[PDB]
């Protein structure tokens, strides 16, 4: 809308001053524990079964 589109910069101004730490990407992340090393150790066992070894 010609009159509304002029304020997208204002919404960017608001959003530029606004701050939120939990987002769709960070909502999926743990508080401090890393799962890779253990689950990849489990996948070491599972991968052999998936390959039928």
């Amino acid at each position: 809308r010609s009159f509304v589109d002029a304020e997208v910069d204002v919404t960017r101004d608001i959003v530029s001053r606004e701050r939120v730490w939990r987002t769709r990407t960070t909502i999926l992340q743990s508080t401090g524990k890393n799962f890779s090393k253990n689950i990849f150790a489990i996948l070491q066992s599972v991968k052999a079964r998936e390959e039928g070894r």
Partner: protein, 393 residues
């Protein structure tokens, strides 16, 4: 911050005080304090949503849109409120406008996606998540990758008699969860997704260990509690499963969630809490009586309790009379379900199969009403002997 702490009263006070003071400070830079007033209005609207003052939440979102109409978060919250109303039509209308404002906004696509997934529209739902990863602004969105994984997993919950369609989806889901967990070691849902596919593949031994290791980081993912509790049922450690379902209901649901209540009923049945199993399913039927699967389970518990009462002649008259009418009611319910049952939720052969067992036991149950009367009389003789012997002393 008080909102982040759950201090709804303090958050309300501070946002209101911020708006009242903002009118005084806006005298220096109206544009800046207007932006601040937008942030304060949105924060207060989000709080009123949590505080259920929905007219003020609606008005504050509309005020932001009156003054700052490109603020996508107002459209999404208006839609989310419609979602909370259960109005997927209205919710989709608000989220669609958000996509009409910013076609690459991932939450708008995701919110409509949630509507499609809840409606079992796996294809249309998938379209929302696929559209996000191709764009550079969201090309690394783990939420969308995981969403495709969840789409495949959600299809895994539906029964396809040809296991390859499911298995093809299993490999699609697992490839996603494996790569996402490789890229982001703190990814809760990729790890759980690997566990979920292993569980569908039947590898409960590893899946339980994975769900436990995910649970160690956080107590707020119900599916991790539910997956653990399901394996505890499968591993026959029913007490632990029951305990998880009871506390899960008290912590996460402000109402009795029939899914958890049903999982609890399944565990309680095996846990020997037949009294609570009965009561839990009666509560479930009281909550969702048109759900024919729960109605079947009620009839089943009535049948299983009666089976015990009817096997042993030590069972008394009130027990037998309750068992007869309860078993008549159960047979009546299976007969009723055979006429009014919801054919899309359960296997039609199951209701017909259990109905027969109820009718058979009801036929045998009539004898016990006559049998039970004598057992009451048997004690009276000893009491009469006791009375004369007391007179002897």
């Amino acid at each position: 911050l008080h909102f982040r702490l759950g201090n709804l009263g303090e958050a309300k006070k501070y946002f209101l005080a911020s708006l009242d003071r903002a009118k005084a400070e806006a005298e220096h830079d109206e544009h800046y304090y207007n932006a601040i007033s937008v942030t304060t209005s949105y924060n207060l609207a989000r709080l009123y949503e949590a505080m259920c003052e929905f007219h003020e939440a609606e008005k504050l979102y509309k005020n932001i849109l009156r003054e700052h109409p490109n603020y996508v978060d107002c459209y999404l919250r208006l839609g989310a409120m419609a979602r909370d109303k259960g109005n997927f039509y209205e919710a989709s209308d608000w989220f669609k406008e958000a996509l009409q404002i910013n076609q690459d906004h991932p939450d708008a696509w995701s919110l409509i996606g949630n509507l499609h997934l809840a409606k079992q529209e796996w294809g249309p739902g998938q379209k929302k998540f696929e559209r996000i990863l191709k764009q550079p602004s969201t090309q690394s969105d783990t939420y969308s990758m995981l969403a495709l994984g969840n789409v495949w997993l959600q299809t895994l919950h539906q029964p396809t008699r040809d296991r390859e369609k499911e298995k093809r989806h299993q490999d699609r889901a697992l490839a996603i969860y494996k790569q996402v967990l490789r890229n982001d070691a703190k990814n809760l849902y990729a790890a759980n997704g690997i566990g979920a596919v292993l569980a569908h593949k039947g590898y409960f031994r590893e899946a339980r260990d994975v769900f436990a290791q995910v649970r160690e980081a956080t107590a707020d993912i119900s599916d991790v509690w539910l997956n653990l509790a399901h394996i505890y049922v499968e591993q026959k450690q029913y007490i632990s499963a029951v305990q998880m379902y009871e506390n899960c209901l008290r912590k996460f649901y402000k109402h009795q969630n029939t899914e958890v209540v049903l999982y609890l009923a399944r565990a309680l049945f095996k846990c020997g809490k037949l009294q609570e199993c009965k009561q839990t399913l009666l509560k479930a039927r009281h909550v969702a009586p048109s759900d024919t699967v729960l109605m079947f389970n009620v009839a089943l518990v009535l049948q299983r309790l009666a089976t015990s009462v009817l096997k042993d002649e030590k069972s008394n008259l009130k027990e037998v009379l309750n068992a007869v009418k309860e078993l008549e009611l159960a047979h009546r319910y299976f007969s009723y379900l055979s006429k009014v049952g919801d054919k899309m939720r359960f296997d039609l052969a199951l209701a017909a199969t259990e109905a027969r067992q109820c009718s058979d036991l009801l036929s045998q149950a009539q004898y016990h009403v006559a049998r039970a009367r004598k057992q009451d009389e048997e004690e009276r003789e000893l009491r009469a002997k006791q009375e004369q012997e007391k007179e002897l002393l």
